[PDB]
């Protein structure tokens, strides 16, 4: 009776389309936010503090052409992947603190084998494990299709650690970052439109790196205006500054909770 069933959003790489991918990212955003908290037109993610554990997580079920299924657990507060589940085994990133350690105990309670990596899920660490930086790692339906397969086979013993790290960077950007950023989502749609694999450019990468900063700048903003500008990059890697909220609205879909409204 007890174990909590978290919302499940299904997506499959098999015969995937721009439409079905857009529908996927919207459903994920739908589950991550009620949309109850909005500052400057941007939906805010639920406050981690005081958050009941039944509202804490959502599940992403991934399927590919190979007919393999892999389930990801996403933290509703940061919209980030805390770990995943394949068959009878579950795997979790090393938690950043004892409360998060406690939280993930409510996940994947029906698996036989439960594992916690010695490493966390941040890009830097994941990049060291993969042996490749995000700028050298391709994104698209192909890679995601490949990432799904590698996640599944890791229990098998059929996936090398670097490959597993590579697949995480793939999954995380193509799902979490897509959900956080309409722009990033838009960059993934473009890969699907053209059936291309491409590693993300500086414009995408600095969005990922600045996400926390932007949420803060937006929530602390005075009538939309920043105290200090934030530097971002054009697709060509050239810098440019954002002094205010209006410019970010088409860009960032979700904000981490910083201050109360």
């Amino acid at each position: 009776i007890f174990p909590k069933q978290y919302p499940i959003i299904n997506f499959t790489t098999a015969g995937a389309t721009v439409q079905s991918y857009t529908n996927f990212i919207r459903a994920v955003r739908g589950r991550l936010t009620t949309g109850a908290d909005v500052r400057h037109e941007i939906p805010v993610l639920p406050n981690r503090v005081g958050l009941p554990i039944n509202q804490r997580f959502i599940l992403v079920e991934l399927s590919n052409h190979a007919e393999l299924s892999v389930t990801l657990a996403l933290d509703v507060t940061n919209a980030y992947v805390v770990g995943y589940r394949a068959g009878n085994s579950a795997y979790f990133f090393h938690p950043d603190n004892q409360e998060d350690a406690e939280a993930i105990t409510h996940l994947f309670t029906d698996v036989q084998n439960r594992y916690t990596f010695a490493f966390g899920g941040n890009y830097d660490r994941l990049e060291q494990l993969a042996g490749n930086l995000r700028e050298n790692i391709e994104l698209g339906n192909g890679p995601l299709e490949e990432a799904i397969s590698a996640l599944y086979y890791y229990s098998t013993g059929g996936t090398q650690l670097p490959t597993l790290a590579r697949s995480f960077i793939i999954c995380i950007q193509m799902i979490s970052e897509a959900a956080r950023f309409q722009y990033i989502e838009g960059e993934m749609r473009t890969r699907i439109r053209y059936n291309r694999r491409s590693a993300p450019d500086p414009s995408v990468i600095t969005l990922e790196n600045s996400w926390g900063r932007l949420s803060t700048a937006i929530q602390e903003s005075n009538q939309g205006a920043f105290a200090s500008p934030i530097q971002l990059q054009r697709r060509n890697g050239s810098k440019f500054s954002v002094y205010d909220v209006s410019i970010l609205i088409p860009i960032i879909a979700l904000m981490v909770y910083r201050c109360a409204p």
Partner: nanobody
Framework: QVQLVETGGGLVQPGGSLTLSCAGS????????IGWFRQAPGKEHEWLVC????????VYVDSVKGRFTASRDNAKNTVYLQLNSLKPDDTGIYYC??????????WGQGTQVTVS
Amino acid sequence: QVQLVETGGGLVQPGGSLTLSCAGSGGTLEHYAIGWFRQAPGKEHEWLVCNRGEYGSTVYVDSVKGRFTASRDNAKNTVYLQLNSLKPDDTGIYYCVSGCYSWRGPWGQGTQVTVS
């Protein structure tokens, strides 16, 4: 499939030492974190150590800090917990799992430690 078997449990006297072994079988635990928990009668499981890598530094709960020591022999594929200066309140069954600071999931038989 990697699994863990605890060993080293015994009966000890106050101030004594003991050495527990968490042995992996069907693969490397090298990149897995390994926690140690203990349960005492009429009491809930409590977390003792978090051993990461290699990788991260090793975390101890304050009460066992400097008393208890974790180490790894890679290729022996085992995580050790060396218990030192044991008190009767260190009594209980000791479990090793891959996880830290909080656990439900299977333990595990554990290996018994009695200090009298």
